[PDB]
């Protein structure tokens, strides 16, 4: 059950790397209508503390990210939507076809909503993101970036 | 989780022995903490007041034991020569004298007080030459063998 689910891997191949990244936009279009169906109130004045709290447990698969701070200078400035989301890494695909892996070690990601911009500090958000929606996101420490 | 202390001994050597009868822990704590504020300023007056306390004092003998830290033993032990004019109801002029600066360790601080006490009574034998006092020395030697 452990090695039998891990025969080859669940990892990508060489041929899906060139799948014409603008065709991954309906995956972002599905996520864009998902956020409007989640809170269903955006415009006049509707609780910015609620928006950043519902995105704690929200499955952010297929969302645009842009690195505005990282400990590595080479990681900063990479844009694209994400496909996989592992323990402390998540694989993104960028502009004209090439995929990149950015670890969730000490960095923050910028997620652009319709009328909101939310930073996600990737040093606390780890540990198998299916379990992130479950339990145990408590208040610990600061993020010195 | 524990503090390293330093224990310094002192001795009042003076004439007019009514000054030795006027010794108290309330007066000694008001004497040492004041003369640090007279020599040094308000820095050493409170840096040598958070661990400073009295533990051992005999007015009939004249041995002073004081408490101080590892980081601030050099302020108390340098304020000892500048202690004059113990003001009281009469006219008194005592002055402290150190014997050995002991680094903590109360047991061997009391051991040095024993060897200092034994050397004081042996010299006192021939210099005094009193028949009534020599019998009191024989009471001190006999009771010390019973310990």
């Amino acid at each position: 059950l452990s090695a039998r689910q891990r025969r080859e891997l669940r990892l990508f191949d060489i041929k899906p790397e060139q799948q014409r990244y603008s065709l991954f936009l309906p995956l972002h279009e599905l996520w864009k209508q998902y956020i409007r169906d989640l809170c269903s109130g955006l415009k006049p004045d509707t609780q910015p503390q609620m928006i950043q709290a519902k995105l704690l447990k929200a499955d952010l698969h297929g969302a645009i990210i842009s690195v505005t701070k990282s400990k590595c200078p080479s990681y900063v400035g990479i844009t694209g939507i994400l496909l996989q989301e592992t323990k402390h890494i998540f694989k993104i695909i960028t502009k004209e076809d090439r995929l990149k892996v950015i670890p969730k070690l000490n960095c923050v990601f910028t997620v652009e909503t319709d009328g909101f911009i939310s930073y996600i500090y990737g040093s606390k958000f780890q540990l198998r993101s299916s379990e992130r929606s479950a339990k145990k996101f408590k208040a610990k420490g600061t993020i010195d970036l | 989780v524990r503090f390293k202390h330093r224990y310094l001994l002192c001795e009042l050597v003076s004439d007019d022995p009514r000054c030795r009868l006027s010794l108290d822990d309330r007066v000694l704590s008001s004497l040492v903490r004041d003369t640090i504020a007279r020599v040094h300023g308000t820095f050493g007056a409170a840096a040598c007041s958070i661990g400073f306390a009295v533990r051992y004092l005999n007015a009939y003998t004249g041995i002073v034991l004081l408490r101080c830290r590892k980081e601030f033993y050099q302020l108390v032990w340098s304020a000892l020569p500048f202690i004059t004019y113990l003001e009281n109801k009469g006219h008194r002029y005592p002055c402290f004298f150190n014997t050995l600066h002991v680094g903590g360790t109360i047991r061997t601080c009391q051991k040095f007080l024993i060897q200092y006490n034994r050397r004081q009574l042996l010299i006192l034998l021939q210099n005094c030459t009193d028949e009534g006092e020599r019998e009191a020395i024989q009471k001190s030697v006999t009771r010390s063998c019973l310990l």
Partner: protein
């Protein structure tokens, strides 16, 4: 522990070197040309009541220097700015009044190395390859990125140039107040006023303070003795303490009173009747000091009444990189400075002042 650090020391260093102007292996020219930032230039000549007219025209022609308000960093990396000032001379840039341990500080080298000092809030947002500069315990707070613009000029379409140019325009806007100056070393002469016509550029002249001090008590020197012979000559260390008091108008005697000034002259000394003072206050090019150093070397072509002259140049308290490698910080003071005690027999003393966290080259 607590009583040791209240009286121990700050870090300071002094390197004293005697040499010859006529020596073929002398580095009196290389140490001044490769010293990048200069603010205070003061020279003294004893027994000089009438200044020579050649030196007086040299003091008034040290600048000028320009000051631009709110200039962004992406303007200094355009190929138009490199081909005008950088490729046809040496252009200098220093962010005015942005301290080296408080905010961001950007500096420019004549070799085309844009070496800038950033804090932690900017080094993580620009995304430029750097390294730590001074350890502040564990939380490293300052970073320095070295960007060589001359190697980017060979391939302007390279991946290194588009990484840096995108990092300043749309990724992180950073405007500063620059102290700009340029040495005219090109065929086509174009002023800086024509290029920066959009922003508020102001042409500034260096402040010149000309004074004459009378009855100065100068020490006795021997050029072949740095440590100082007893009761015959003086130590070179003792003149470096004496020289700052003459420029700071401190020349007094012994006054036993309520206000005793315990500042004695270094003995043995000599009563000197006249002493000429000068203070050139502004952003000084080091190439102008090289014409000033060689004029003071040619000051002893004729037999003069002065035994030795003075050339002391004080740098900024805000310079990131001086002496081509030394990252000058700011730990409760500390400034970089060098000195020239030029004698009549083409010998000079090189007294380099080192600050708190700073190193020294030969």
């Amino acid at each position: 522990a607590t009583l040791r650090r209240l009286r121990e020391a700050p870090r300071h260093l002094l390197v004293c070197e005697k040499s010859n102007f006529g020596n073929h292996k002398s580095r009196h020219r290389h140490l001044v040309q490769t010293h990048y930032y200069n603010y205070r230039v003061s020279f003294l000549i004893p027994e000089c009541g009438i200044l020579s007219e050649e030196l007086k025209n040299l003091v008034m022609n040290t600048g000028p220097y320009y000051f631009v308000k709110n200039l962004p960093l992406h303007e200094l990396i355009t190929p138009e700015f490199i081909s005008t000032f950088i490729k046809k001379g040496s252009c200098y840039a220093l962010t005015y009044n942005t301290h080296i341990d408080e905010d961001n500080t950007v500096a420019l080298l004549p070799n085309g190395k844009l070496i800038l000092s950033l804090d932690k809030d900017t080094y993580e947002e620009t995304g430029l390859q750097g390294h730590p500069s001074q350890f502040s315990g564990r939380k490293i707070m300052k970073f320095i990125v070295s960007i060589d613009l001359m190697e980017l000029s060979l391939n302007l379409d390279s991946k290194k140039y588009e990484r840096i140019s995108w990092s300043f325009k749309e990724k992180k806007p950073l405007k500063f107040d620059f102290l700009l100056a340029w040495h005219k070393t090109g065929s086509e002469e174009s002023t800086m006023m024509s290029y920066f016509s959009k922003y508020q550029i102001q042409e500034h002249q260096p402040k010149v303070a000309l004074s004459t001090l009378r009855d100065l008590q100068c020490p006795v020197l021997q050029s072949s003795e740095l440590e100082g012979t007893p009761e015959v000559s003086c130590r070179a260390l003792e003149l470096f303490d004496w020289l700052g008091a003459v420029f700071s108008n401190v020349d007094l005697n012994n006054e036993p009173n309520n206000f005793i000034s315990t500042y004695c002259c270094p003995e043995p000394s000599t009563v000197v009747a006249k002493a000429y003072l000068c203070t050139i206050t502004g952003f000084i090019l080091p190439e102008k000091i090289c014409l000033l150093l060689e004029h003071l070397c040619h000051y002893f072509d004729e037999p003069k009444l002065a035994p030795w002259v003075t050339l002391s140049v004080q740098g900024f308290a805000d310079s990131p990189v001086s002496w081509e490698k030394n990252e000058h910080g700011f730990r409760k003071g500390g400034e970089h400075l060098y000195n020239f005690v030029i004698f009549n027999n083409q010998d000079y003393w090189l007294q380099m002042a080192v600050g708190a966290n700073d190193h020294c080259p030969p």
